[PDB]
């Protein structure tokens, strides 16, 4: 019943789960999957999973579609290539490195390939419960030492539909194809409407500065425009420390939310649990209707944030802030 | 008084300085430099600095050589391109992303260019005190909020006294493809070996260099960046050390080495206990400094942590772990103790 758990709970409650906790681990070939937030733990709001894997010369999965789930690919570290296509639109591919993001709405064909030896892919899937597929195809892993990974169609019920006619394009240059795309060389926009895949390289997407509680920079990844009926938001939030004269705000939202620290040290105080400090890869989950406070102990922290509903923490900070063109906040309060 | 400090001390002593602490910050144009370890703070053993900067369409510094300093470029986050050339050898260039490493021995022409918006370059220079150059080039920055960087002839002689020798004829090559040039190079697509020849620059992509597994105090994986082979008389080692937790049945070892050493956490949560100071837990980018001859203990509270480690001398912690370990081909440690 303590706040920190080794596997996500089997019912909705506040919790924190450390990076590389057991988290119902399974392996699929050389890949190791951890389920930090599950359907049961989030009341089916979303799934937050981590995949660690070594370099592979082959695709990590055969090309496929999910008709009822929206997947979000975030590169925690290392690098992996992601391919995506909607309808008959041109097929897109990007090589994601640390902090890069790839959006895969429902009905978008996709696959990936792990490039670097110490690669970690954080997946946020909406709605929650998609992890059953990985329990099913996976082999349970005890992983006593908590090592990141181990050194070395008919799945319609799980919402997986094969796309055997898809051929991942092979004309990648400087991490992107086709050639007329912007990747780490300029600004990236979110898709103009729902249904289309899109990618945002670390620090190149739109940002908003909120100065109500110290400085926080929200970099939206998914908004109402893209989520539509899937009804969620996703972004990174970067944070300064909170000045001594500023009260750390208490929040209570209609929907569940969660974050995974990427950089820095973030303290979270949820419900009646102790204020707890989270470091890299650690995850905090807050049920809808539960009060919480968070602040950065580090001088700069950045977290990956997901929320069920259209008016979660990220959107609130955006609406209370202003457009902003830097990954850094002002030097003066 | 307090193990944690906001600026590197003006003398040798155990300390920890948190990521983005003031650290006697200066700005050089859009770049913000923090001096986590200085000549005075390390007894002149080495300098460890952090440079945070936005994308630039221009070189971050005019091409130059240092005759008496060995520089080490480590990419904490973001990305920057680095060019390097030893004498008449082929000019090399790589685009470094998170966890990538570039080695620049004495007498090697080099320059860099910041590519990504949130870029952080950790520089380790031997011997220490090299930072005086940046005190001169730079303008003091108060940076009250500790933001990573601030949003939006005559010199010839001066620069030489700082061990900076301009190479005006050097033209950084412009035929980069997939983050590397020339074509016959290995970058994120295969193993990188440390240079077998002293004086030659070399690069190691994250996780692609040689590694060693030490199983004496839990699992630790050392990934050497600089060894005696390369350092020679500069007399130091540089590597990353990855760590598992320490099993309850294993005693966390107490270490002491003649030379000063230091580390900056890259990933995870690492507890350090130095001398008679209280144990302190370090996170992303935090730096711990241990004077030579001072006893210290460290362990990882995270299930996996990785630190960038530098040591003065030929047989510091990283070399010790290697000597007590075995060749290893994975960035992960075994699943069983
Ligand atoms: C830059 O790096 C990219 C990878 O990000 C390299 O792309 C790779 O290019 C090779 C050679 O063209 C492709 O392999 C070839 O694919 C064709 C088509 O299937 C096949 O007929 C050949 O037998 C060979 O296997 C490879 O698929 C492609 N990889 C990706 C992910 O696109 C690119 O070549 C690099 N450029 C340079 C100049 O180094
Ligand atoms: C892949 O990305 C690389 C950068 O990593 C691109 O290399 C860049 O290529 C351009 C044009 O060839 C170079 O600019 C040119 O430089 C010359 C010489 O100074 C000048 O005469 C031209 O006016 C122009 O400015 C650029 O310097 C070079 N960058 C680097 C760092 O090498 C490459 O073009 C990309 N390849 C593809 C297919 O996208
Ligand atoms: C996805 O495709 C299926 C089958 O064509 C279709 O029934 C469904 O409406 C699509 N869903 C969305 C959200 O477009
Ligand atoms: C999977 O679970 C079974 C049943 O409890 C166990 O015996 C086996 O060792 C597990 N496999 C792994 C790889 O952890
Ligand atoms: C969106 O999610 C919020 C928060 O969970 C929920 O209260 C609301 O009913 C949802 N809206 C729709 C139309 O489902
Ligand atoms: C570097 O070059 C200088 C000037 O040519 C030379 O005097 C010195 O011996 C060289 N140093 C090293 C370590 O090679
Ligand atoms: C810059 O800071 C240094 C170190 O504290 C100080 O010695 C120097 O005088 C400062 N420069 C100015 C102009 O104040
Ligand atoms: C190398 O450094 C160590 C530790 O500071 C020192 O004890 C040793 O004498 C040095 N060796 C040389 C050749 O300077
Ligand atoms: C394994 C990556 N993934 C989960 C985000 C899919 S291919 S759906
Ligand atoms: C600022 C980068 N640098 C220090 C490592 C040199 S060009 S010497
Ligand atoms: Cu999928
Ligand atoms: Cu230099």
Write the layout of secondary structure elements.
Two copies of one chain form a homodimer.
Chain A (H helix, E strand, L loop, with lengths): L14 E3 L8 E3 L2 E7 L1 H4 L4 E7 L10 E2 L4 E8 L1 E8 L5 E6 L3 E4 L3 E7 L4 E8 L5 H6 L1 E2 L20 E2 L13 E2 L20 E3 L6 E4 L5 E7 L1 H4 L4 E8 L17 E7 L2 E5 L5 E3 L4 E4 L5 E5 L4 E8 L4 H7 L2 E3 L9
Bound molecules: a molecule of 3 linked components (NAG-NAG-BMA) (2 copies), 2-acetamido-2-deoxy-beta-D-glucopyranose (NAG) (6 copies), diethylcarbamodithioic acid (2 copies) and copper (II) ion (2 copies).
How would you describe the overall organization of this protein?
Two copies of one chain form a homodimer. Chain A is mostly beta strands and 333 residues long. Chain A folds into two domains: 1-143, Jelly Rolls (Sandwich), CATH 2.60.120; 189-333, Jelly Rolls (Sandwich). In chain A, 6% of the residues lie in helices and 38% in strands. Chain A contains four helices and 25 strands. Chain A has helices at 39-42, 132-137, 224-227, 313-319, and strands at 15-17, 26-28, 31-37, 47-53, 64-65, 70-77, 79-86, 92-97, 101-104, 108-114, 119-126, 139-140, 161-162, 176-177, 198-200, 207-210, 216-222, 232-239, 257-263, 266-270, 276-278, 283-286, 292-296, 301-308, 322-324. In chain A, the strands form five sheets. The first copy, chain A, has an eight-stranded antiparallel beta sheet with strand order 1-22-19-24-18-17-16-25. An eight-stranded antiparallel beta sheet of chain A has the order 12-2-3-4-11-6-9-15. A four-stranded antiparallel beta sheet of chain A has the order 10-7-8-14, with no helix packed on it. In chain A, strand 2 (26-28) and strand 3 form a beta hairpin. The first copy, chain A, is globular, with a radius of gyration of 19 Å. The interface between A and B is large, with 57 and 57 residues. One 2-acetamido-2-deoxy-beta-D-glucopyranose binds next to loops of chain B.
């Amino acid at each position: 019943s303590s706040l920190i758990v080794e596997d996500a709970p089997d019912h909705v409650r506040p919790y924190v789960i450390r990076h590389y906790s057991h988290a119902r681990a399974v392996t699929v070939d050389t890949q190791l999957y951890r389920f930090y937030v599950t359907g049961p733990s989030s009341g089916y709001a979303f799934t937050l999973m981590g995949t660690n894997a070594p370099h592979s010369d082959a695709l990590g999965v055969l090309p496929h579609i999910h008709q009822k789930h929206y997947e979000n690919f975030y590169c925690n570290k290392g690098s992996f290539q992601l391919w995506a296509q909607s309808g008959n639109e041109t097929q897109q591919t990007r090589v994601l490195s640390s902090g890069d993001y790839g959006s895969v709405p429902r009905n978008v064909t996709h696959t990936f390939q792990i490039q670097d030896p110490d690669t970690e892919m954080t997946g946020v899937i909406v709605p929650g419960g998609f992890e059953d597929l990985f329990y099913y195809l996976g082999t349970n892993a005890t992983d006593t030492t908590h090592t990141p990974y181990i050194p070395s169609s008919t799945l319609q019920s799980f919402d997986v539909y094969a796309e055997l006619s898809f051929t991942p394009r092979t004309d990648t240059v400087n991490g992107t194809a086709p050639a007329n795309t912007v990747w780490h060389t300029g600004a990236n926009a979110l898709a103009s409407t729902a249904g289309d895949p899109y990618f945002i390289a670390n620090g190149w997407g739109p940002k908003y500065l909120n100065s109500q509680y110290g400085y926080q920079i929200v970099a939206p990844f998914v908004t109402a425009t893209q989520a539509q009926d899937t009804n969620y938001t996703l972004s990174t939030i970067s944070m300064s420390t909170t000045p001594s004269t500023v009260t750390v705000p208490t929040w209570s939202f209609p929907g569940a939310c969660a974050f995974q620290v990427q950089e820095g040290r973030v303290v979270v105080q949820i419900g009646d649990y102790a204020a707890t400090e989270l470091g890299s890869g650690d995850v905090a989950f807050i049920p809808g209707g539960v009060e919480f406070k968070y602040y950065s102990e580090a001088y700069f922290s950045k977290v990956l944030f997901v929320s069920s509903g259209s008016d979660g923490l990220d959107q609130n900070l955006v609406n209370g802030g202003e457009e902003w063109s830097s990954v850094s906040f002002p030097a003066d309060w």
